[PDB]
Amino acid sequence: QISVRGLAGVENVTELKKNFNRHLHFTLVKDRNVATPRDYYFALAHTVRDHLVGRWIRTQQHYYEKDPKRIYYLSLEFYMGRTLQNTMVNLALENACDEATYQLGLDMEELEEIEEDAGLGNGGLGRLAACFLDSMATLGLAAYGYGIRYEFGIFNQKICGGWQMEEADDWLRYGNPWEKARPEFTLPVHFYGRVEHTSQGAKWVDTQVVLAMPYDTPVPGYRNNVVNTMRLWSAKAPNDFNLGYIQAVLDRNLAENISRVLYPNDNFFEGKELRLKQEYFVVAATLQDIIRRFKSSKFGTNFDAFPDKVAIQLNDTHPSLAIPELMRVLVDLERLDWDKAWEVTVKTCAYTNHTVLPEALERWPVHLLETLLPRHLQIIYEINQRFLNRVAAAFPGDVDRLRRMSLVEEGAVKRINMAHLCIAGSHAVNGVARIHSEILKKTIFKDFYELEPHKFQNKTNGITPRRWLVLCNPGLAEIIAERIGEEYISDLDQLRKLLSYVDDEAFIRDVAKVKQENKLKFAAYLEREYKVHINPNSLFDVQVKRIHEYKRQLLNCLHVITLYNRIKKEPNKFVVPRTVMIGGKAAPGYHMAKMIIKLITAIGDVVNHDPVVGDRLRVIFLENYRVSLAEKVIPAADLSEQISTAGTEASGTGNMKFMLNGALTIGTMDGANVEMAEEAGEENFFIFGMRVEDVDRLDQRGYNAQEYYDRIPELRQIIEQLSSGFFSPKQPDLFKDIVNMLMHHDRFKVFADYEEYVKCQERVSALYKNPREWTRMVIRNIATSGKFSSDRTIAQYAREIWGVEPSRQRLPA
Amino acid sequence: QISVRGLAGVENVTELKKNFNRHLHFTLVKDRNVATPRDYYFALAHTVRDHLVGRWIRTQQHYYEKDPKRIYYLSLEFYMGRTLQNTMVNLALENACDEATYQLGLDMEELEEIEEDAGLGNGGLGRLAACFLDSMATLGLAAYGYGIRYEFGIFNQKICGGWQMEEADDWLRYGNPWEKARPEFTLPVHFYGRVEHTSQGAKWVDTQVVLAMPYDTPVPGYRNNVVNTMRLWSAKAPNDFNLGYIQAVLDRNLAENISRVLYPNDNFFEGKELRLKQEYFVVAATLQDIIRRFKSSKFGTNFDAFPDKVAIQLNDTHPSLAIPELMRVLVDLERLDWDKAWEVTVKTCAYTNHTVLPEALERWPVHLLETLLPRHLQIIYEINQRFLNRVAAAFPGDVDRLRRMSLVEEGAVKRINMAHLCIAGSHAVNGVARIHSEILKKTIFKDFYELEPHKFQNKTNGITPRRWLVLCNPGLAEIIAERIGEEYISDLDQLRKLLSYVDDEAFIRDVAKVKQENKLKFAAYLEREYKVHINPNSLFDVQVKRIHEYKRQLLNCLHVITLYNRIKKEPNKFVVPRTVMIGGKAAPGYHMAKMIIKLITAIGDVVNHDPVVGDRLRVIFLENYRVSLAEKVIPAADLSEQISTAGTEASGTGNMKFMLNGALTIGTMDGANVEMAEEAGEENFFIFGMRVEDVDRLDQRGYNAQEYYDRIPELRQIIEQLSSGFFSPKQPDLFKDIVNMLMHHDRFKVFADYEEYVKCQERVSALYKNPREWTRMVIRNIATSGKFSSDRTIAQYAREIWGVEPSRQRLPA
Numbered sequence A, B: 001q002i003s004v005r006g007l008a009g010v011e012n013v014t015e016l017k018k019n020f021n022r023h024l025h026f027t028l029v030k031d032r033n034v035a036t037p038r039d040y041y042f043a044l045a046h047t048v049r050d051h052l053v054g055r056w057i058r059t060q061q062h063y064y065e066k067d068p069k070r071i072y073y074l075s076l077e078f079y080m081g082r083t084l085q086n087t088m089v090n091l092a093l094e095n096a097c098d099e100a101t102y103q104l105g106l107d108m109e110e111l112e113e114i115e116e117d118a119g120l121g122n123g124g125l126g127r128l129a130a131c132f133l134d135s136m137a138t139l140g141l142a143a144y145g146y147g148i149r150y151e152f153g154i155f156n157q158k159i160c161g162g163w164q165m166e167e168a169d170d171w172l173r174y175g176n177p178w179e180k181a182r183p184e185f186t187l188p189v190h191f192y193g194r195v196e197h198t199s200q201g202a203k204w205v206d207t208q209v210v211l212a213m214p215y216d217t218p219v220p221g222y223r224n225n226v227v228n229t230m231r232l233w234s235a236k237a238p239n240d241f242n243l244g245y246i247q248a249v250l251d252r253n254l255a256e257n258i259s260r261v262l263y264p265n266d267n268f269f270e271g272k273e274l275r276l277k278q279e280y281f282v283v284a285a286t287l288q289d290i291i292r293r294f295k296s297s298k299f300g301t302n303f304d305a306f307p308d309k310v311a312i313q314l315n316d317t318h319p320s321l322a323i324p325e326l327m328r329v330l331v332d333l334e335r336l337d338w339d340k341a342w343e344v345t346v347k348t349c350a351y352t353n354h355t356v357l358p359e360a361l362e363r364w365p366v367h368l369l370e371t372l373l374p375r376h377l378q379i380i381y382e383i384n385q386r387f388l389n390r391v392a393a394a395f396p397g398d399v400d401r402l403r404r405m406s407l408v409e410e411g412a413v414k415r416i417n418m419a420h421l422c423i424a425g426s427h428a429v430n431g432v433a434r435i436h437s438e439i440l441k442k443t444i445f446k447d448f449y450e451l452e453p454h455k456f457q458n459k460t461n462g463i464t465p466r467r468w469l470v471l472c473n474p475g476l477a478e479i480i481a482e483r484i485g486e487e488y489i490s491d492l493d494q495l496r497k498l499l500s501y502v503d504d505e506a507f508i509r510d511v512a513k514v515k516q517e518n519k520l521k522f523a524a525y526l527e528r529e530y531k532v533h534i535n536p537n538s539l540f541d542v543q544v545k546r547i548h549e550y551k552r553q554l555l556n557c558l559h560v561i562t563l564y565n566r567i568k569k570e571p572n573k574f575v576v577p578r579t580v581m582i583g584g585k586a587a588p589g590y591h592m593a594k595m596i597i598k599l600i601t602a603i604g605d606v607v608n609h610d611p612v613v614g615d616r617l618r619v620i621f622l623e624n625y626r627v628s629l630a631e632k633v634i635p636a637a638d639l640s641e642q643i644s645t646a647g648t649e650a651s652g653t654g655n656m657k658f659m660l661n662g663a664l665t666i667g668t669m670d671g672a673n674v675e676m677a678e679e680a681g682e683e684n685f686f687i688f689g690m691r692v693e694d695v696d697r698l699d700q701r702g703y704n705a706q707e708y709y710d711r712i713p714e715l716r717q718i719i720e721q722l723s724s725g726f727f728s729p730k731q732p733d734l735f736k737d738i739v740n741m742l743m744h745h746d747r748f749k750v751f752a753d754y755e756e757y758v759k760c761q762e763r764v765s766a767l768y769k770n771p772r773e774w775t776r777m778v779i780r781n782i783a784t785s786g787k788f789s790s791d792r793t794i795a796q797y798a799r800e801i802w803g804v805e806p807s808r809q810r811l812p813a
Ligand SMILES: Cc1cn([C@H]2C[C@H](N=[N+]=[N-])[C@@H](CO)O2)c(=O)[nH]c1=O
Pocket: A265, A266, A267, A268, A359, A587, A588, A589, A590, A591
């Protein structure tokens, strides 16, 4: 149907149809008489999968022959979403499959909805890993994603009586056609035991063994015939495990629990033993795999060349145990001396920091490591001692610096600071947006920056334009392609060419038309799938992201209530109609986040059923927000809410997705918002609120929320409404926790940004009254969104950290 | 190479090779450069599997159109072994695959050894189920095997220091290419809860739900294009299970433990709750599936025709809960009155008894059923009351009969006798050999036989000649086929034609040649796989079966020691050389059986290293005895030991396997040995020892083992040797338990059969000295083994129990 979706050649369509029928018969063991839509989905998935394998085998063969430097991206999270449409896009198969399925009497879009999300992440950090894999393959890098194959990913969120309920994400129930089990490459991982000292150094003995079984998933580059690998480890008990008889067999579960479930915490550290086991499990199996591949190379025993052939990227501190594990292997097993091993380790490892929030920093109790990983603790102590000797020599007499920089934190419980370990053992440390990277050097890692300034870098985050434009917004990709061609898909800077169309009446009409169609499609989706009725002529005001105090969904709530109260005060006055959509999951143990969800639904309950309001204001909580839902709501959005307190959101990536898809942004000067505004021009952004410096000034003075309550009558009214039970008639004190927090212990200064936020929202509404000028501003945003492609981000990692050159060159088909 | 293995047509070989290469590439994602023999096995398995699916789909389609009476074979055990070679044989593909793999530079026999046994059974009972499935498909019956897909089958047995060690049978590790998951047909199973009474009868409420997910495995008939289904259920937790968060997800294991492991008890009842859950799990899911299929038929609401369209065969009492579960569904859910429901139940169900040993009988504590299955207990009480009212009316005043026949046993703990439940609720009850069936009517079920004589039948066991001749002994199948053609493979009575070749010098030479080749092949196997050296010119004396006191491996041990002592007494005297092979697993908690294994190895330790013995006597314990090992050792055997105490082995089936493969039998008049001897003529069997009547006479008098010890000097010497530490120098009292048992508490009268056994063994040795006459007797055995085909057995079930006609007619290809 549309150009960007590839050719539907007679030969290809015929070949796809017959292979579809073959899979339905031989693979699914069905005929057309008994097949369900799920069967049809699987026959399609298997057909598309077949096109990958040849490229997959020759890509890996190519790397064996050429022996390039290999990039190992270590992450506990890969938030992949669905794979079917993504694979078709990158293989140029979408129109052909659409045609082949149409001719078989099937709707491909219906079949696509059947695929489960691979929900192996929490949010930003996990989704960045997924975007990174796509970009690395697209840029021809010899890259491998390594992680854990969780049996249960992020929970499915149900809303019951306005409250979040969690249910198990049993994503493997019907099978996963994309993965290939590789039981032949199973590796042992050791836990517990004790350390023994001999003439030949230390020995780790009396350990429990858990097996790590790899599952490989293909990662196709964009139309370049490159197919990289994501390898995910699964925990298996050895066959002599605990070997009365029946119980010993049943106890195998204990070992296999390691890969059972993803910890559903976003930007929060929970010091549980199972989590530590997961972290070591991925690290130990991965490093063995890395070393095996290194020894079995066309190049080489000699570990001097190890950093020339291997880069390990640590996605946050979660795989920080890679550092002492690499030391363990090199010193204890390969018998390298400490200094040489350390040189190799530092030159191999690099660390990416994702947040400055203290509650997210990993600080493991020493007693946990002592029991679980006794040899790693000894190595960490030794790293610490040698590192602090370096600090002492550079800053003689500075005893407080020594305590501040120590990997070992003293106190009630002794802890290991994993961030400090990462900096010490990596040749590069990066933040994820310019402002965040500067905050690292100025505040939390100031001491480390003074010692080793060369180590500190910025790599501003990005998103893949394949998933986040072509796949989810084909209509927009197409109108862009009509004007400037298709090259921008793997070279997003070319979107600048769109600036010369900002006064083009045809283009203005097309941009606005694509948005309306997206909005109609999403409005229909809501009725069909959730039985909720919305006005597609209203401004789609959306905030979608994990529920957090720092992300300030509560500030959004305050604005919504302000609009409601203003309408109630002057009912017959004209207001720009809005659909306010808020979505995201709360971590199960995060009480305040669960209260905020309840608040949003409670506001909806009052606002959506007030006859005086009509269809002028609607508040909807978007249930079970996840990658596949993001692909639907983001193209439909007019307004993107990025309203975190300045200095708290390291980068954000949702912001970039909205910019690419034709939404205007209301936000603070936080994270990547700063660079986005810089790229588009501040005139083309709705920036409000305190800057980082203003927050610091308020902290020194002391934040007093009562002041704002006293001086802003509209804010006072909202607090009285919350307190008195206006939004909870049956349970008048339901929201006392929220009011108390806002009035007395608000770390994120919600009240302090209220006035400017409400005023800025009025400026948004005014612009929306003028469709042509709204759309012209939109064009100015889309046109300057190129910097935020993960292809740019990965090219920067490649050149400035990994020491490898990106390549757009095709491999032969 | 050989005739019976089918055609190797140019078209077929070419087509097999290309499909092999396709699977290696697309299915396994490998090329010839990286593929292991395991990969080659899997590519072959997938290629052969493809040939099944078309036949599988049309067989099931055929049953839907024709709507025949369906047979449901309910078993907790299906001892399937390997599937690859069996599938090739039944599809006439073996030579073609052999040729196709040869041309690809691969040895097919090497690839066949890579397949894991499906070890989902303990021994005789589970293997009978497997033979039955093969025969039912071969006879064109619309039959379904229903069971549990255990994650761990029967343990792998390792021998360490002469002791049995158990390790987990992780048979699914590398995947199972034969099964197809059917998550779309998942069904709920209920546990616990309570019973509520309403105006509309009883209601079972507040239950825990476990999901039952079916996996279908194809069962091909012999060259008739029929492919039936074995459906095995797997336990899955529902997604809201226990739904802090992490623990709730981890606790899903509790539910899924139901299908985790096979209870490794052979002929022994262990009253564990998990076992009861397994029994109800298979029954509840199966019956829902049965009823669903019944309602969705071309015929029919009206349950009057239910027994016309459905037969349920209960393999032992393990699925006995089918009876009250069917009542529950019909009464509580379908709202049929009790009397009608009961009529339907009785006419639907039939029960096969497998043993008379009291320790094997299932007697469940009432308190277990009360908690787990409260509604089923109420139904059982009601069945009991109505049944005992019938007994009271037929035998007025006979109060002891009432207590003897009650389904409820009184005592310390109240128990339900599941055998009594089965008889009451089935229209047919059968034993598994003529002598066993007579013992049922005369002893343990005498009262029930007096009440309902019409219910009691015999169905003598059988084995499939496909697996147990063609597959494991192609050399013998071929020389037979040269003389009499190939029709005997699905009509084993035709082997009688071989009687006219008993004086044929060519045939005599060929029979003896096939045995020698088998013996050489097995002797080589032992060296390669276990590094043990044996003389292939010796008589292969083999006893393979589960380790039990009743099977009297100990009597065999006594004979072995007698031979050793006789050699030591007169070293320079000639004795017929023997390799004595004993193999089988002991249940992990069965101490005496584990001691017997230790004894066998201990004897081997002394005998195998005595220079005076030389290669005249060898004692070998065959490790990890299982179906695949049976297929190797049985064709190599000269002497088959079937030496259970008369009246204890209900049938046996190993006996029949040895008879079919050219071994002579030494045995008691027990189980099917009686019918085997009757078929071949007693002159052509080595029968010894007490008959059932002699055992009873000894029981009345009182068995005194001391008497035999006093009067048999050779027996006395063996006991002194055991006691004094002759076979355990480091641990002189190691075998005190065994001696004490033999002397004081021997339920199985080992000493009482010693003299006759030893004398009979001398007659065996004498015959073996005359090769021509040994082989002529062998021919007389093979030639009369036809009755013991499971095709005969199943034809008898079909006609006399299920009310269906067998068919040899081909379905179209
Ligand atoms: C599970 C979870 C809890 N919390 C709770 C833990 C802290 N309890 N205290 N004190 C509180 C403040 O960080 O928030 C959070 O912030 N994020 C989370 O993800």
